[PDB]
């Protein structure tokens, strides 16, 4: 399934305050009325220039992401788990499950070698770009 992005997907290009000014800037943005894929499951999807993600959940079912290339412990990968009261951003050589999931239990990866990073700190929209 596909839907109409309408006028969603705009973000603040930088950390600069501007008042009553029209600012012209070129960056990676979601085109207006663009075609975005509607998923109901969780297959592996491509990541191109950057990804726009959105969800309309009341039960908070979707609450994390895996980013990387191999996702099989061969290369360092980024795992995010917005769990309970503590969202953990961790970058390691994770050996991910071939069908990773969280329980209601954590079965995302089977191994986590060469860890390099750890940090702890309705309609939800996110933009992810590297």
């Amino acid at each position: 399934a596909y839907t109409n992005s309408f006028t969603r997907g705009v973000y603040y290009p930088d950390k600069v305050f501007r008042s009553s000014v029209l600012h012209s800037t070129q960056d990676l943005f979601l085109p207006f009325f663009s075609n975005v894929t509607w998923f109901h499951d969780n297959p592996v999807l491509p990541f191109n220039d950057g990804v726009y993600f959105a969800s309309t959940e009341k039960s908070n079912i979707i609450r994390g992401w895996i980013f990387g290339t191999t996702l099989d412990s061969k290369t360092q990968s980024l795992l995010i788990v917005n769990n309970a009261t503590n969202v953990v951003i961790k970058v390691c050589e994770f050996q991910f499950c071939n069908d990773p999931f969280l329980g209601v239990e954590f079965r995302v990866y089977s191994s986590a070698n060469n860890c390099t990073f750890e940090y702890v700190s309705n309609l939800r929209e996110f933009v992810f770009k590297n």
Binding site: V16, F17, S19, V21
Partner: protein, 166 residues
């Protein structure tokens, strides 16, 4: 001061700002891509950046033919930064400002004109001419009895030197 706030560098005067920044905005920029406000990295105070005062310095004087006394105008400079008279055109030093209006002599801008009077240089708001109320009414008329012919001189340029450069 020559300032460096994180990665924002430059020279200027910093004052308290009355702007309200969003929690994630580090500095402000105007319509001409000039930084005009910064958030203080330590105390979360917003400061406005005003470029350091500068301007032309002009000397207003009657010619050395009459007096060697001069007055100096600092254009767009406030007098606390430099007979001291603060006017809309800048800070004027050496002229005595007076209330009596006269025909404008030497222009200083903003209606203020200077003149050499009995002697010193003075500054005043220029007069636009003598007032002359007309005795208007619906029933009375005035006609010249002794007319005068006037000869005036109007000078216009017609041509210029025919310079030819190879």
């Amino acid at each position: 001061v020559n300032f460096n706030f994180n990665g924002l560098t430059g020279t200027g005067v910093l004052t308290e700002s009355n702007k309200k920044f969003l929690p994630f905005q580090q500095f402000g920029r105007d319509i001409a891509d000039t930084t005009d406000a910064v958030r203080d990295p330590q105390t979360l105070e917003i400061l406005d950046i005003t470029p350091c005062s500068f301007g032309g310095v002009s000397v207003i004087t009657p010619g050395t033919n009459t007096s060697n006394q001069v007055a100096v105008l600092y254009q767009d400079v406030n007098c606390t930064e430099v007979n001291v008279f603060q006017t809309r055109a800048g800070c004027l030093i050496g002229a005595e400002h007076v209330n009596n209006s006269y025909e404008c002599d030497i222009p200083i801008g903003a209606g203020i004109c200077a003149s050499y009077q009995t002697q010193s240089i003075i500054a005043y708001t220029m007069s636009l001419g003598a007032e002359n109320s007309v005795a208007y009414s619906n029933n009375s008329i005035a006609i010249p009895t002794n007319f005068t012919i006037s000869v005036t001189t109007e000078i216009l340029p017609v041509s210029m030197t025919k310079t030819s450069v190879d």
